[PDB]
């Protein structure tokens, strides 16, 4: 995973969304705009 630091995030947010959908919905979308 991991992509220089930035989808790290966007790795859980693909799969461990299903337990999150907020708590993590708040990095991939706007610290690189998906």
């Known amino acids: ?3 220089d ?3 790290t995030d ?3 947010l693909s799969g461990a969304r ?3 959908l ?3 919905q ?3 979308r ?3 705009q998906a």
């Open 22 to 24: 907020a708590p993590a």
């Open 30 to 32: 706007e610290t690189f």
């Open 5 to 7: 630091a930035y989808r």
């Open 1 to 3: 995973g991991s992509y």
């Open 18 to 20: 299903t337990f999150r």
């Open 26 to 28: 708040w990095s991939c």
């Open 10 to 12: 966007c790795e859980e």
